[PDB]
Design a protein around this nucleic acid. Structure first.
Ligand SMILES: [K+]
Ligand SMILES: [K+]
Ligand SMILES: [K+]
Ligand SMILES: [K+]
Ligand SMILES: [K+]
Ligand SMILES: [K+]
Ligand SMILES: [K+]
Ligand SMILES: [K+]
Ligand SMILES: [K+]
Ligand SMILES: [Mg+2]
Ligand SMILES: [Mg+2]
Ligand SMILES: [Mg+2]
Ligand SMILES: [Mg+2]
Ligand SMILES: [Mg+2]
Ligand SMILES: [Mg+2]
Ligand SMILES: [Mg+2]
Ligand SMILES: [Mg+2]
Ligand SMILES: [Mg+2]
Ligand SMILES: [Mg+2]
Ligand SMILES: [Mg+2]
Ligand SMILES: [Mg+2]
Ligand SMILES: [Mg+2]
Ligand SMILES: [Mg+2]
Ligand SMILES: [Mg+2]
Ligand SMILES: [Mg+2]
Ligand SMILES: [Mg+2]
Ligand SMILES: [Mg+2]
Ligand SMILES: [Mg+2]
Ligand SMILES: [Mg+2]
Ligand SMILES: [Mg+2]
Ligand SMILES: [Mg+2]
Ligand SMILES: [Mg+2]
Lengths: 139, 109, 201, 352, 190
RNA sequence: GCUGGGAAGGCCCGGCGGGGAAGGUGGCUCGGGGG
RNA sequence: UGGGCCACUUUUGGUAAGCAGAACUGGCGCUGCGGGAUGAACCGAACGCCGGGUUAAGGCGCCCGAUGCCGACGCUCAUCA
RNA sequence: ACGUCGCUUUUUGAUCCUUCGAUGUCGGCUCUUCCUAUCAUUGUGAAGCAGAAUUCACCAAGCGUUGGAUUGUUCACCCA
RNA sequence: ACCAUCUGUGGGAUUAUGACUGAACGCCUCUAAGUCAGAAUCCCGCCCAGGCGGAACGAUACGGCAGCGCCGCGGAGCCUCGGUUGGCCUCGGAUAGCCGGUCCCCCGCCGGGGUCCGGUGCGGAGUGCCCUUCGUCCUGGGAAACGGGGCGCGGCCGGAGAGGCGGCCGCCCCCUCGCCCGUCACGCACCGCACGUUCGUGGGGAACCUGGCGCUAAACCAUUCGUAGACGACCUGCUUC
């Protein structure tokens, strides 16, 4: 059933806390509740971190457990996570959620205008498809 | 052409369990459910708008049955987005669980 | 809010849901709870049945017709639980209690309306998966409730009619997605505006 | 301290509101459980307590001292002229109980039935159901009537027929008929509506409801006794003759605590005119009632195949405080609640 | 202490296949189909091999009480494989001192009639569970053969017969009469 | 500002090295798989 | 005024006592207020009439002000928790 | 057994907090309800339980637990 | 009047206990997960009462000006009660899993399964969606033109758990408008200021005028009955064959 696992090299996304919104790599695990955590290319220095604020991604790096930050950074940079992360639907929903929050009053007005026209054109075509599909005369 | 005020609820007076201080009221503002989000509403004018039987003069309008007790948000109450408000006259107890409008007038933004 | 809050009682813990509903009605909000037979109580069933049987024992020795009234319907059981969390002997509390409407099953006014959920009172998040719980409908049935079978048949009828609505809703959505593909040239101008501002990823 | 010697309590607490019945007829309160496998039939009937007599029969009970032995047995005669069906009621099962869905009344409601709808038939102008009977003739009304039957057929779970007795066949002073909802059991809802529809305005004799030597339940109101003391109402022990302020009392009506008089203590009040249902009353005979084919035939009422005498069930000089029994009658074993000419409800046994 | 992983694997034979729908194991052997859900246990079920058909049960972060359920599921699954491949056969002997216990098997082996248990006139009517067939053996004089696919149902059907023939108000050590499960075994003997 | 004139840590593949190992990499051995 | 009573601790008689008798300090009596649901004596704190701020002891599911913290680590299932 | 830990308030003491401008003081009679530490009955387990009988224990207070002689008696004792 | 006679009832979850399967503890085990049987106990049924609790149905006020119902938002107004300040018209649910889509198979043209393809910190997302209000006048480009709006009529269908609601046609009568981007100017621009902005033609009570369609009754007292009864109350009768 399970597809994403806590393991050495597993890249996790920080949901809350001082490092919320960052990507980190799991270097080691301690006492079932915390893990040795290091994001050298995402500005998170090595430190303990509860598993509760983590959300596992699909990226797994290859380095030995408790390896130095240099080797984690080399593994992170080779097959770079930063560009791969930005291309996922997960990240671009985070980005879309961010730009919607920063939308100003003028942008809200222009979105209201664009949404109005888009919905009327779409909902026109829905009626046309409905009316077309209504012509069913067959035994 | 618009609501122009935030919806708030007069939950009750500032109180201990067995002592009630009626001069100040605790308001629950809609959508504000944490203390860190109450900063916007501090100092904002709040109004308890109600209707009575006899007509009263309306500023810039014909007399009608609408009355109002004005106030303002003073500070945050608790950790969950409650605010304390002072009104020119202590809010009647019949208004508990009813509408208080927050005006946005004294804007700091 | 000024509209009625319709809460689905299935999967919700009795006391946890009652605490939320009690503060809502004290804040002037109208709350409707449906499917009170689907409400859960933590602890194995036998234990929770003993608690109600102990409640049944509390009666006025001199005149039971005046004593505690033991309601056997799940909706009235939940209603009494909320009443224990309201100042029901004051006018403010009686006004709040009159803002609560409780139902077994989902009656015709609310069967066609969307029903809310309170995560803080849900069994899946509030209760450990290895713990035992009891269904309010079963507890009510075995302590005096008489309408478990008819409510089940009517709930099964309602579910069949809801499936038809969902298939029409899904068919409509499929047609809308096809429409978006059909009119894409005359829509990309407004699609781009939505995307720049976080709507329509 | 504990009472010195044990003794069972006087009277039952299952009949506690020892009050006058709110009704005079005696309602069924529980019809036999319906199973669609059985044929469509009626479950209840109304009769009138004519009087009592006794019979001689032969007991066929093996292993008994009375096997192949004559016995005499008190029987009650309940005059049962045929019902007239004048309506149909539909019920729908709800999580709040059964609620009445729709009622359809037949055309041509008899005057004796229409008297039930009035408190002063003398000063009345007999307008009841005058505008309702017209919808049985016009086209809008008939279409609306067909919709009502169709809605009953698709939404109702149990149906009942409103049937009334025939006063003018009785020897009583009362001309106001008695109406009862009689449940229809045994079949699909469509089948029991078709059965009920074709019995509208018709007569249902007691033969079609009950049969020979079957056990039925009798529902009625007991004889009134007025306001009575504890000695008669609860059959408590009479106090010794030396008692100062009265001996027909209960000496202690409670202890110091709970500091109130409890509901279980015997206290003076109404006795009689209580609603009661007695189960397991055997039907010893269903009498044919008087007939005229060429001459007055009265034999069948009280003639037995051993007796062969041209005599009616009516005693010599008539049933005391009732009159003469002319219609159908049911001969029940034993005694039955109520005074003479008291309306009784006969219901099919709920038991197997 | 919470153990990270407690796992155990059962080996599925070739003539029987196992299909998983969540924690619902469907076993489709030559003798029929056995289906049973385990949604009351929070475990992970996986079909491993396409060649040898391994089924692995895993519990993650389990306490002592819920590590005990790992082998319970495996044992239950192994009985499903055993039931649909060989079946379950329970042999019961009717022991008596004086009154012989007359057993009559009614429709399709689903009803059992016990007549003369301890010489009393009451007739014991024990209904077999669905999928369980009772019969009178032709090998020994006083045997009952209970055959079926589910060990739960076959054994509970046998317990129903055994508990029906219970001596009461007497010394059970002296009045040993009754019908008792003699051996528990399979059909087809493989 | 002080501290162990902070402790760790980052970069300089830290370079000349030495030693230790194991929650043992590669390799090798044994046992189970995909062409 | 010359009837006292209560609490920590020490302490005598008594099986013990919301019993009887002493020592020491404080209290109630003479004292309201916050908390202990409730309560002479406990905990906090002693009081003119008020506004603002902050606390004590005690609390922050709902009654009922305050956790509506993405609180931390464990322990515990009770058919009289 | 020697020891030792409890529970109860249906005994009797101990105390004297309430009542001395008054809470009618024994027993019986009558009547209701409650408890269980179960005599009987229902369902069970155990035996030095062959059967019959009896004893120990469990769930258990739904139901019942009587007529009399002597005594004011509560108690007691006997008859059935 | 046990001093005569008649009648007195079914089910469910389960207790004790005895078991099944089965680990823990490669054995065993009634227990841990999961199951079985199980009683004067418990709950309900049967039975008694029937809520400041509902339902269905009937009849609903004159022979004279006399009361009432429905239809009209029909109008002019009074007295009184105030709340509120966009909507969401619905799968079932699982949580050691879900959601969507598609070809073959089976069910009488859609569902139901088996592949296969996607999504899953839910984006076919309630952290969501829909509607979005300054109004008009010149005036072009796009959207549409298979359009809109008629308390216009008429017909039909679906909804019963409290349906008090929703939908679809036919005919008719009007706008080429209304939606987006532009051109073009105007409107009390009331000279900084609050109760503004909606639901709303709100609820309730008397009363006037205005048209159409309709209705012409009961209850109580008094009298009587005695199936009833302290009194109330209750069961009854009172010009037709
Ligand atoms: K207003
Ligand atoms: K006594
Ligand atoms: K002095
Ligand atoms: K002195
Ligand atoms: K004592
Ligand atoms: K005393
Ligand atoms: K005294
Ligand atoms: K005596
Ligand atoms: K005596
Ligand atoms: Mg006794
Ligand atoms: Mg005297
Ligand atoms: Mg084994
Ligand atoms: Mg014996
Ligand atoms: Mg003195
Ligand atoms: Mg002194
Ligand atoms: Mg002292
Ligand atoms: Mg003293
Ligand atoms: Mg003094
Ligand atoms: Mg002093
Ligand atoms: Mg003080
Ligand atoms: Mg205090
Ligand atoms: Mg306390
Ligand atoms: Mg202050
Ligand atoms: Mg508190
Ligand atoms: Mg609060
Ligand atoms: Mg006194
Ligand atoms: Mg006195
Ligand atoms: Mg007194
Ligand atoms: Mg006991
Ligand atoms: Mg008698
Ligand atoms: Mg057991
Ligand atoms: Mg069972």
């Amino acid at each position: 059933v399970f597809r994403r696992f806590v393991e050495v090299g597993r890249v996790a996304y920080v949901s809350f806390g001082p490092h919320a919104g960052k990507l980190v790599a799991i270097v080691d695990v301690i006492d079932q509740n915390r893990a040795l955590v290091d994001g050298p290319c995402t500005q998170v220095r090595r430190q303990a971190m509860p598993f509760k604020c983590m959300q596992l991604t699909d990226f797994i790096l290859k380095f030995p457990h408790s390896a130095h930050q240099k080797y984690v950074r080399q593994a992170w940079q080779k097959a770079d996570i930063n560009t791969k992360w930005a291309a996922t639907r997960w990240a671009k929903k985070i980005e879309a959620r961010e730009r919607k929050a920063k939308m100003t009053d003028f942008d809200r007005f222009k979105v209201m205008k664009a949404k109005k026209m888009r919905n009327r054109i779409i909902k026109n075509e829905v009626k046309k498809l409905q009316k077309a599909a209504l012509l069913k005369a067959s035994p | 052409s618009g609501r122009l005020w935030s919806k708030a609820i007069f939950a009750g007076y500032k109180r201990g369990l067995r002592n009630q201080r009626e001069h100040t009221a605790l308001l629950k503002i809609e959508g504000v459910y944490a203390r860190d989000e109450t900063e916007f509403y501090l100092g904002k004018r709040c109004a308890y708008v109600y209707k009575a039987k006899n007509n009263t003069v309306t500023p810039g309008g014909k007399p009608n049955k609408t009355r109002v007790i004005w106030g303002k948000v003073t500070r945050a109450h608790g950790n969950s987005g409650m605010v304390r408000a002072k009104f020119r006259s202590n809010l009647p107890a019949k208004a508990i669980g009813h509408r208080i409008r927050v005006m946005l007038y004294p804007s700091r933004i | 809010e000024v509209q009625v809050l319709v809460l689905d009682g299935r999967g919700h813990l009795l006391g946890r849901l009652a605490a939320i509903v009690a503060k809502q009605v004290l804040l002037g909000r109208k709350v409707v709870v449906v499917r009170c037979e689907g409400i859960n109580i933590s602890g194995n069933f036998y234990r929770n049945k003993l608690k109600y049987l102990a409640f049944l024992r509390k009666r006025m020795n001199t005149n039971p017709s005046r004593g505690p009234y033991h309601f056997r319907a799940p909706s009235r059981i939940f209603w009494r639980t909320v009443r224990g969390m309201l100042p029901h002997k004051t006018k403010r509390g009686q006004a709040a209690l009159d803002r609560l409407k409780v139902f077994d099953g989902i009656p015709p006014p609310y069967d066609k309306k969307k029903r809310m959920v309170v995560p803080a009172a849900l069994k899946v998040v509030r209760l450990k998966p290895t713990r035992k719980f009891a269904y309010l409908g079963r507890l009510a049935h075995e302590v005096g409730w008489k309408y478990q079978a008819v409510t089940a048949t009517l709930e099964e009828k309602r579910k069949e009619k809801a499936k038809i609505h969902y298939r029409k809703k899904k068919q409509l959505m499929r047609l809308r997605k096809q429409a978006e593909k059909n009119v894409e040239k005359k829509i990309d101008k407004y699609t781009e505006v939505l995307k720049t501002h976080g709507l329509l990823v | 301290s504990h009472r010195k010697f044990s003794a069972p309590r006087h009277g039952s607490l299952g009949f506690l509101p020892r009050k006058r019945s709110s009704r005079h007829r005696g309602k069924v309160k529980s019809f036999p459980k319906d199973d669609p496998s059985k044929p469509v039939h009626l479950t209840a009937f109304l009769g009138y307590k004519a009087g009592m007599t006794h019979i001689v029969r032969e007991v066929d009970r093996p292993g008994s001292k009375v096997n192949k032995k004559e016995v005499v047995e008190a029987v009650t005669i309940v005059e049962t002229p045929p019902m007239v069906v004048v309506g149909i009621v539909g019920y729908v099962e709800t999580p709040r109980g059964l609620r009445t869905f729709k009622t359809v009344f037949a055309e041509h409601i008899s005057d004796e039935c229409k008297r039930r709808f009035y408190k002063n038939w003398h000063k009345s102008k007999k307008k009841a159901f005058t505008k309702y009977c017209k919808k049985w003739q016009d086209e809008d009304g008939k279409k609306q009537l067909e919709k009502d039957f169709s809605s009953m057929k698709k939404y109702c779970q149990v149906i009942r027929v409103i049937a009334h007795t025939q006063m003018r066949l009785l020897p009583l002073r009362q001309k106001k008929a008695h109406l009862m909802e009689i449940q229809v059991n045994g079949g699909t809802v469509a089948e029991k509506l078709d059965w009920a529809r074709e019995r509208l305005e018709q007569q249902v004799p007691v033969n079609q409801v009950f049969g020979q030597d079957e056990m039925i339940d009798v529902i009625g109101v007991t004889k009134g006794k007025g306001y009575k003391g504890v000695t008669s109402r609860w059959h408590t022990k009479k106090l010794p003759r030396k008692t100062h302020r009265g001996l027909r009392k209960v000496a202690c009506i409670g202890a110091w605590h709970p500091a109130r008089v409890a509901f279980s203590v015997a206290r003076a009040g109404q006795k009689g005119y209580h609603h009661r249902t007695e189960i397991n009353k055997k039907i010893y005979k269903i009498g044919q009632g008087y007939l005229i084919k060429d001459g007055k035939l009265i034999k069948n009422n009280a003639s037995t195949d051993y007796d062969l005498s041209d005599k009616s069930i009516n005693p010599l000089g008539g049933f005391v405080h009732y009159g003469e029994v002319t219609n159908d009658f049911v001969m029940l074993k034993g005694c039955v609640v109520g005074t003479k000419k008291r309306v009784l409800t006969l219901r099919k046994s709920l038991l197997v | 202490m919470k153990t990270i992983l407690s796992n155990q694997t059962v080996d599925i034979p070739e003539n029987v296949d196992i299909t998983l729908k969540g924690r619902t194991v469907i076993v489709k052997g030559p003798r029929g189909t056995l289906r049973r859900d385990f949604n009351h246990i929070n475990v992970e079920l996986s079909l491993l091999g396409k060649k040898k058909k391994r089924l692995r049960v895993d519990k993650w972060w389990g306490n002592r009480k819920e590590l005990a359920t790992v082998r319970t599921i495996c044992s239950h699954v192994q009985n499903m494989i055993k039931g649909v491949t060989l079946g379950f056969r329970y042999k019961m002997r009717s022991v008596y001192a004086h009154f012989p216990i007359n057993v009559v098997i009614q429709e399709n082996g689903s009803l059992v009639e016990i007549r003369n248990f301890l010489g009393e006139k009451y007739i014991r009517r024990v209904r077999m569970r669905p999928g369980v067939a009772c019969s009178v053996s032709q090998a020994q004089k006083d045997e009952l053969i209970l055959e079926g696919n589910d060990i739960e149902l076959v054994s509970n059907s046998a317990a129903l017969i055994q508990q029906a023939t219970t001596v009461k108000n007497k010394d059970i050590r002296k009045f040993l009469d009754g019908i008792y499960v003699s051996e528990k075994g399979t059909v087809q003997q493989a």
